[PDB]
Hints:
- The chain is an alpha+beta fold and 388 residues long.
- It is built from 17 helices and ten strands.
- The chain has helices at 12-27, 38-51, 65-70, 78-82, 94-98, 122-127, 137-148, 166-173, 190-204, 217-221, 234-243, 280-290, 293-302, 316-320, 322-331, 343-358, 364-386, and strands at 4-9, 31-36, 57-61, 101-102, 105-106, 109-115, 117-121, 229-232, 251-254, 266-273.
- The strands form three sheets. Strands 2-1-3-10-6 form a five-stranded mixed β-sheet. Strands 8-7-9 form a three-stranded antiparallel β-sheet. Strands 4-5 form a two-stranded antiparallel ribbon.
- A hairpin with a 2-residue loop joins strand 4 (101-102) and strand 5.
- Helix 8 packs across helix 9 (190-204) and helix 16 (343-358) runs antiparallel to helix 17.
- It starts with a strand and ends with a helix.
- The structure holds a molecule of 5 linked components (BGC-BGC-BGC-BGC-BGC) and magnesium ion.
- Magnesium ion is lined by residues 148, 151-152, 154-155, 206.
- Magnesium ion binds next to loops.
- Belongs to the bacterial solute-binding protein 1 family.
Amino acid sequence: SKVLNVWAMGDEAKSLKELAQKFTKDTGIEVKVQVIPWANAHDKLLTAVASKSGPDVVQMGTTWMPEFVEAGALLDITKDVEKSKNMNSDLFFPGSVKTTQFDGKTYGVPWYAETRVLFYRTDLLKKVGYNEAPKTWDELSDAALKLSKRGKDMYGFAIDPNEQTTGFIFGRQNGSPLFDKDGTPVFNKKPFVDTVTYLDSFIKNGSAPDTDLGLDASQSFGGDGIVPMFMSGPWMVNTLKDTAPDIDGKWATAVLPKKENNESSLGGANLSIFKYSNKKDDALKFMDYMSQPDVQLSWLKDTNSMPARMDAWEDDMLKNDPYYKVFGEQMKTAEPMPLIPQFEEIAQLYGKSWEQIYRGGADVQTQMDTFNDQVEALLKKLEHHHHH
Ligand SMILES: OC[C@H]1O[C@@H](O[C@H]2[C@H](O[C@H]3[C@H](O[C@H]4[C@H](O[C@@H]5[C@@H](O)[C@H](O)[C@@H](CO)O[C@H]5O)O[C@H](CO)[C@@H](O)[C@@H]4O)O[C@H](CO)[C@@H](O)[C@@H]3O)O[C@H](CO)[C@@H](O)[C@@H]2O)[C@H](O)[C@@H](O)[C@@H]1O
Ligand SMILES: [Mg+2]
């Protein structure tokens, strides 16, 4: 009734729940945190919109902000965050702020950022002649194939078929804008088509697994390094340090390999107030509480997570820790996925087309024509909603 309901995701939800104890101690506001896996969170949010009942505070994946702003699910908090020492936009990376601001109105406060980088086994790269991480698409292909040639059930590089960012990241690296200046999808034009060919090359030549092997990060990257290279975010630094002691000093991260560029994705999460909340005041207090820079830095550093607030990167560990140095370097040019309200739907369509290619053996051009058409059809449906 007076309990503040907070919906949060994954491992970071534990830090939120723990920080919430002191908030309750200091205010007398009881907090209930529902911990939702990222794989289920989109559906949970759709259900909340359809029933107009949900939490008071919601942790929003950055890529879902356009969707849920457009759906009218997130409170416009522009006036409230403008007046705040700790939630004003000027504190946050411009890319992170782009995930919160639509048509001049602010719909959340950045909570953490992330970007994707290359994880690699330094010992195993050295053995196939790479003293440094692969720096180009050609090198990543070459190193991966040499690594897969260790033997039948040994690989070189992972492509996560459920990762929304992967095809879009590589596409931009090869000069695809993904949507052109007019908003027309261009997933069937040469830059993107060659991107998907390149990703499929690892599958077809046996250097990326073509099924889920069912190994944890420790078992695939650790030991003899069955999967000796992959792409992920800060959460994997923390996971590997905790779970793979056998490769201590035998792995590192590096910025992504380049094609025309090496741009990564900018993501993370924001805190937002659900528009139907009866406790908007207490929601805002919680957000402000959670935005205190020392409270933030404490859990961020402990988890190797990336702050969205700029001045946090002046902290000595963020400047000097090897993992943070690489994340900070990549963050410089990291861009959010297209900030469009059908993003998840489009990413899941990409996932199905990817599956058709890597598992079904579909032609990449034919499949990308099919995918692009699907995307244009979605966009036209939304257009028709805006034009009668
Ligand atoms: O897409 C919505 C939202 O996601 C935000 O990303 C979250 C991230 O979630 C991603 C999820 O990660 C789960 C992890 O999977 C591993 C991959 O991260 C890794 O790169 C890959 C290596 O090839 O191996 C996978 O196993 O598994 C953990 C359980 O063991 C989960 O705790 C973790 O959530 O991976 C999915 C695809 O496989 C992605 O769809 C999903 O987005 O989880 C992070 C940890 O909680 C979190 O820090 C991150 O913010 C993204 O930031 C945001 O911009 C998007 O809107
Ligand atoms: Mg092999």
